[PDB]
Amino acid sequence: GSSST
Amino acid sequence: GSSST
Amino acid sequence: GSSST
Amino acid sequence: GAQVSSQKVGAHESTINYTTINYYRDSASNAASKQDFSQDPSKFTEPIKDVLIKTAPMLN
Amino acid sequence: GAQVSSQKVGAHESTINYTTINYYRDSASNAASKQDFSQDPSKFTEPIKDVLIKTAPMLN
Amino acid sequence: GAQVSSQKVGAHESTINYTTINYYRDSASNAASKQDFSQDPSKFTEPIKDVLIKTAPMLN
Amino acid sequence: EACGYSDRVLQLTLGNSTITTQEAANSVVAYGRWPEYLRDSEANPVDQPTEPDVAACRFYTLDTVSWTKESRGWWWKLPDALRDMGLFGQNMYYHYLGRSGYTVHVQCNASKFHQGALGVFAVPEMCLAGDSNTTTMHTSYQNANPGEKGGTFTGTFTPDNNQTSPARRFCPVDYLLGNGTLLGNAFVFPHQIINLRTNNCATLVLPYVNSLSIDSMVKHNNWGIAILPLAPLNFASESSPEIPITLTIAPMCCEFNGLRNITLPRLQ
Amino acid sequence: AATSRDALPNTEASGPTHSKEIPALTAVETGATNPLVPSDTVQTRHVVQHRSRSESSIESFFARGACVTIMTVDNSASTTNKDKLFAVWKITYKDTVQLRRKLEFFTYSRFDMELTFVVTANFTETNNGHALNQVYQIMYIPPGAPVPEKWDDYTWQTSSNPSIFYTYGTAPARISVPYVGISNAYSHFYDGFSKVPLKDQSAALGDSLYGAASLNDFGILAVRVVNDHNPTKVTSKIRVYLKPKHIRVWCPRPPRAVAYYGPGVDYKDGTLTPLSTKDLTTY
Amino acid sequence: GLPVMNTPGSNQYLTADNFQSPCALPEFDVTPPIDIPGEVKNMMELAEIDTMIPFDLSATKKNTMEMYRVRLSDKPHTDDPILCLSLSPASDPRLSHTMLGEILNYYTHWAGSLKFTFLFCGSMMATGKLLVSYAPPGADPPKKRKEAMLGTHVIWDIGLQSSCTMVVPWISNTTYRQTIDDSFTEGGYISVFYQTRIVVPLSTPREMDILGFVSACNDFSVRLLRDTTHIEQKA
Amino acid sequence: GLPVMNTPGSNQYLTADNFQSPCALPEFDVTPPIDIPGEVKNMMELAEIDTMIPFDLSATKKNTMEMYRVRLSDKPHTDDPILCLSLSPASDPRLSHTMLGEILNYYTHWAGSLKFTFLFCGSMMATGKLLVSYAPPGADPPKKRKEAMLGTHVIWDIGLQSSCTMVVPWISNTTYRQTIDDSFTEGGYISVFYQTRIVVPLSTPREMDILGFVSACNDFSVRLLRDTTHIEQKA
Amino acid sequence: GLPVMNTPGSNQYLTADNFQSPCALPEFDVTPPIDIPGEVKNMMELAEIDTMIPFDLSATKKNTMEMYRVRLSDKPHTDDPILCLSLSPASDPRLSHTMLGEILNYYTHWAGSLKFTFLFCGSMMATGKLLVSYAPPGADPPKKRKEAMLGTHVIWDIGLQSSCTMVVPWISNTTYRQTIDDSFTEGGYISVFYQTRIVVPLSTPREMDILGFVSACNDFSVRLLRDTTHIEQKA
Numbered sequence A, B, C: 001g002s003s004s005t
Numbered sequence D, E, F: 001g002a003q004v005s006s007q008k009v010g011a012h013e014s015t016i017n018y019t020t021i022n023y024y025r026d027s028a029s030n031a032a033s034k035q036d037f038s039q040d041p042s043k044f045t046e047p048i049k050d051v052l053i054k055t056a057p058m059l060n
Numbered sequence G: 001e002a003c004g005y006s007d008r009v010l011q012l013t014l015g016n017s018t019i020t021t022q023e024a025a026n027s028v029v030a031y032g033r034w035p036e037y038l039r040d041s042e043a044n045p046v047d048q049p050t051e052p053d054v055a056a057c058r059f060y061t062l063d064t065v066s067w068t069k070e071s072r073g074w075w076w077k078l079p080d081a082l083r084d085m086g087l088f089g090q091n092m093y094y095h096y097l098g099r100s101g102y103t104v105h106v107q108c109n110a111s112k113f114h115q116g117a118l119g120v121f122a123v124p125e126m127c128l129a130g131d132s133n134t135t136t137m138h139t140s141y142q143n144a145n146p147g148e149k150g151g152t153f154t155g156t157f158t159p160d161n162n163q164t165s166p167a168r169r170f171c172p173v174d175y176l177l178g179n180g181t182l183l184g185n186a187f188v189f190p191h192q193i194i195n196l197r198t199n200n201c202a203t204l205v206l207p208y209v210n211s212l213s214i215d216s217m218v219k220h221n222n223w224g225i226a227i228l229p230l231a232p233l234n235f236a237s238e239s240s241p242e243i244p245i246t247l248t249i250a251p252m253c254c255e256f257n258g259l260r261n262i263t264l265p266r267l268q
Numbered sequence H: 001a002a003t004s005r006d007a008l009p010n011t012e013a014s015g016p017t018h019s020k021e022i023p024a025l026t027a028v029e030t031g032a033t034n035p036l037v038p039s040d041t042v043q044t045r046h047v048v049q050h051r052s053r054s055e056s057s058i059e060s061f062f063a064r065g066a067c068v069t070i071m072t073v074d075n076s077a078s079t080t081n082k083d084k085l086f087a088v089w090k091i092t093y094k095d096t097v098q099l100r101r102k103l104e105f106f107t108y109s110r111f112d113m114e115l116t117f118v119v120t121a122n123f124t125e126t127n128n129g130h131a132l133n134q135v136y137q138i139m140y141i142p143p144g145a146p147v148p149e150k151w152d153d154y155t156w157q158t159s160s161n162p163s164i165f166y167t168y169g170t171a172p173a174r175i176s177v178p179y180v181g182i183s184n185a186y187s188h189f190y191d192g193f194s195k196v197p198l199k200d201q202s203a204a205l206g207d208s209l210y211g212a213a214s215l216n217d218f219g220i221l222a223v224r225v226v227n228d229h230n231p232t233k234v235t236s237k238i239r240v241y242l243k244p245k246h247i248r249v250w251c252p253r254p255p256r257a258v259a260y261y262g263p264g265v266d267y268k269d270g271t272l273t274p275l276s277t278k279d280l281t282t283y
Numbered sequence I, J, K: 001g002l003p004v005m006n007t008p009g010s011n012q013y014l015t016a017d018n019f020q021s022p023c024a025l026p027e028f029d030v031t032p033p034i035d036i037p038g039e040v041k042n043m044m045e046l047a048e049i050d051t052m053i054p055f056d057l058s059a060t061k062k063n064t065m066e067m068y069r070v071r072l073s074d075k076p077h078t079d080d081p082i083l084c085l086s087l088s089p090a091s092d093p094r095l096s097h098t099m100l101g102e103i104l105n106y107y108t109h110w111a112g113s114l115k116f117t118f119l120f121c122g123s124m125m126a127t128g129k130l131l132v133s134y135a136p137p138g139a140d141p142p143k144k145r146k147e148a149m150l151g152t153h154v155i156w157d158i159g160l161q162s163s164c165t166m167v168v169p170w171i172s173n174t175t176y177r178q179t180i181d182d183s184f185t186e187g188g189y190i191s192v193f194y195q196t197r198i199v200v201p202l203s204t205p206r207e208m209d210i211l212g213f214v215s216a217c218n219d220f221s222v223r224l225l226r227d228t229t230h231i232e233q234k235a
């Protein structure tokens, strides 16, 4: 879905 | 994902 | 939606 | 990472929105949001040390 | 599979983000993230066997 | 309908991924996944009726 | 230490050999990496390695050279300088592949009335420039590899003009570090300085460095040792002072792969 | 966990001193650089440091495309003493000087290669006769694959070699290449030979170039105009730009100080004086 | 329309690309697979099969059946080579046309262990001991048993187990070797010698052939796809 | 198709861009890294290493080993400079070719503190006190100890600790200085003087060299990447 | 590739567009802001500051300091105008060059209330009553106090509070007026008259100046950005 760094 | 202003 | 391999 | 904001709708045909996604690492590459703030003119229009009350004599 | 990271915002008009999606199977096709690490210079600047205390005599 | 898979990362700058969406009804239109399997050579290298034990005499 | 221990006084022991010094300026470990054997996760040739341990990882002393007012500098290559050193050299020429780290100990004493300073540099891949301006990359194997005598630097580039029978040797100009880069910057390589008022030796511990885990020691040199007079030798008012410089070097954690008959190189 | 874009350390305020602590005295013989900061030798104020080293990270230092070669091709009628011109180039970063100098601050490197191709054409002779839009084939020929002898021979079929068919006037072409070295890193310097000269062998037979390892390190690019020839002559140039992405480097070196003179570290007589005159006590 | 910006690479055709594209025959009724025997999933499976070496490429023997036959005889012991071969699997002329060699010519780089198996084809009454050698590169190539003994080797006793295998272990400086003759990535030397001699009784042929085979081990791989030089199309 | 509208910038090639692009060698078996000693992560690490200054660029001493040697002698005390240098790390000829200087010539702007370390190379019997100065810009450049004393300085006593360091603290009007000679972003003046004098006993050399080194402090940074003028390619 | 269809507008460059574009200097270390005094967030803040009106643009007084001075004297009462001005803030020559006027010339439309403040600069001993008028458009422009009285006005008594303000309230048919002379969006008439007369004692100047100022109220706005005619670049 989504990775958030 | 999503920001809503 | 999404598949993840 | 999508940013959803509302349009101020002028001529009409609920809130209409628009979507924005930044494609680059550098904030300099971004478009302008136009979501800007206003401020009071005072630092230029009333730069005096003692607060002005407009109904009062300016000089006392 | 979207990757969302923050920009270090330089000139200004919350955290501003940007989105990245890899379109290819080979990591070689990917753009550079620029999310890089730093390290201490020591292996080049203090390559000595006995740790240096800068207030102390270097030779003792 | 997005398919998310991992890249085998070769030169480096967690798992890096890439995204794939099929745009057409016919599987023939799809790109190749390159997610392929391997098999043992035996049907060509040891096609004999009685299993070979390599430490043993091949002929007995 | 209150029990006498000093940064200047060291003892090094490898195999049946010991070095003592009473005037060191600490010692250097190149890039902070101590020598190691090749790990299984980085291994490449699959045959059982030969590890000669104390038979080869011991201090070998090379031929002593002489430092004078006219000295421009000296250079050596590793493993080349050790190719004829006891069982290290034997193990090297019997195998296709070899890797090794080193303790390099440069020795030069004088007196409180002498002065001078040697920059001692260990350079990974110390490629040196040739003598020709009609051809490039043409220094012969024999001239590239002096063995223990090493070579020297010069203050002047002087091109080989015999085109019939070219010298095919290096012409390493000192202020250009023999490779077209400025000597003042050689300090980014692991180094020590022998400044005669301060110390009488330099000690460099070198890891095996290469773009491979193991390689041909006979075809390829991993490290270069360059010694140059940063401040010239001087003593009292003698016009012609001289003091000796001795190199003692020990292989460390060396291992060899690909055993066969011994290599007999064309060295002259 | 410290990142390239993190701010550098704050200056801490510091006052007068009178002690046995001697930061200023040191001994460069040890091989170490004295790790001093201004508060070690002067009085300082507190400063909140905002500056970062982001643009000098190895990646950011190299994150630019650099021209490494110019290839010339034409689209002319092949005639008994001269054939239609196709170009052949041995891949390298050493034909030009700027990227070479930057890479050579280091001994070894690993990176993915991004190649961008800028293509330009022109008429060479006066006739008002025209040409139609050209398509170019950029074939990568890895060491061992057959090199083309003619603009139109069988090798341009490319069943296995990667080729780019570039259309003139469209966006510059671009492909990526993984780290393809046969070693664990690319060697910017190789102090050695590819052959050992044996005594029982002739000198000629044991000979090889100083500092060269694999003869055809990375292979060839062969470029041609795919179009048949026009009555009028058109010449084209393919400028190749190399960017090292996802890069790592080891063992720092002093930069090239005198002009490059070939693929090795050799230098030419007459080029050895980089420094200019300046008096010791003149600012 | 969605705002977009065309990047470099736009409109090119890279023959190695991997994109989707419209189907010219929509809704076509495809014939199902059936379970045909002999499916291959990776070219290295073929590299692991033994194929026979054209060892004797003499002017009269090359391009004939004879090139596969290595002649031995019952002559007195010698320390001189029965055969000598360079470990250059894609380029030495005796190896380059084997199935292994052929597949390697579609790739730029090879790595891993190999194995040579020899088959004795003399009569049952013929006996013998041979020495099969592998000398990793860097010294004088072996021309006498004395030198070859010092490297990797197998002493083969001829008997009921007709064949013998010598494994050439992966021993290299580089992580991959080139599939062309290259001194930097040279592989070394394969050679075969008489350990004792071939001995036969009376009424027996005094000369015979051995045959040789090469194949890749399970740790063997190739990379960087390329066109071969083993086929062309002039005009 | 999805409605799209091509924006300005479309089809250009910016050499500084950061886009994805198709791989010409799909599924290539990459060789893993190994832990090679000496990895660098940022060019400023190299700027923090001491490299030696070519202080004496006189017509006869430049482009020779001599340019690195600053000659001192045991002459009577003078208030006259041993050396004078402008704090223009990328452009003053004595600094521009140091490793710091070199890296700075790939960037347009520099900022932060620097440090100069001097090494005494006379005999052990030689003694002395020197004054190392930094005068921030804007006044008459110091030519006498009298002026240099009034600025940032270190009085160096020669003895067993062979070397001495003077830190040039970041003192600037602008947040970054230019890497070229520029009056607006000028850095000021480095100079060295005799505080007392070099004294030697008999039987001792009366003249000797000091060597000087420059390196960046941990608060030092550069920005705006650019091509250098320190290399070219005519034809 | 994803199927897409190029729409009208594709590849154009609209100077007013708002798109993203690649950065030519990636990872550049930006200098932080500091809190500089006097930040402006909207041009109308500047429109709300009083700036002085060049009322007397006579052939000899224009483009001199005199154009700002309105001369009064102690003459007997008259019903005749001290000054007459059209409410056309961006185009009447006396208003168009004030800071308000200037900003309005970068826009096509203006709306909202304005205010005129007059400053008496005679001696303390000078007294007087004046009438400041605003006549919304559509009738005969006032030339006598009689007419001006019937519109919006302030009777100003001169004394210790030196200045007096008349607010021109937003009174318009259209929601926005044009920033050029236009009869449909005309604003009307500003005028000043003597209510009684200026009276001075003996030993006092009989003539003096008043100065005038204009600024926008908080309900004032502009729209439709445009290039001004107040600057050019011939050749």
Ligand SMILES: CCCCCCCCCCCCC/C=C\[C@H](O)[C@H](N)CO
Pocket: H091, H092, H093, H113, H115, H138, H139, H140, H162, H163, H164, H175, H177, H180, H181, H186, H187, H188, H217, H218, J024
């Ligand atoms: C259709 C275009 C395909 C282009 C394919 C190019 C593949 C070859 C990549 C070459 C890698 C060159 C790396 C640079 C040089 C080396 O670092 C040094 N000289 C030492 O190894």
Ligand SMILES: *C(=O)CCCCCCCCCCCCC
Pocket: A002, B001, B002, D001, D002, D021, D022, D023, D024, E002, E004, E019, E020, E021
């Ligand atoms: C946050 O962005 C998560 C959702 C992702 C939505 C689709 C993104 C559309 C394509 C963006 C490509 C990346 C641009 C570099």
Ligand SMILES: *C(=O)CCCCCCCCCCCCC
Pocket: A001, A002, C002, E001, E002, E021, E022, E023, E024, F002, F004, F019, F020, F021
């Ligand atoms: C993770 O990626 C899940 C979300 C998918 C978001 C939309 C992807 C945008 C189009 C990508 C096409 C695939 C590229 C090969």
Ligand SMILES: *C(=O)CCCCCCCCCCCCC
Pocket: C001, C002, F001, F002, F021, F022, F023, F024, K003
């Ligand atoms: C599964 O795909 C659900 C998520 C949809 C993600 C965005 C799709 C991007 C545009 C695809 C268009 C359709 C192609 C025919």
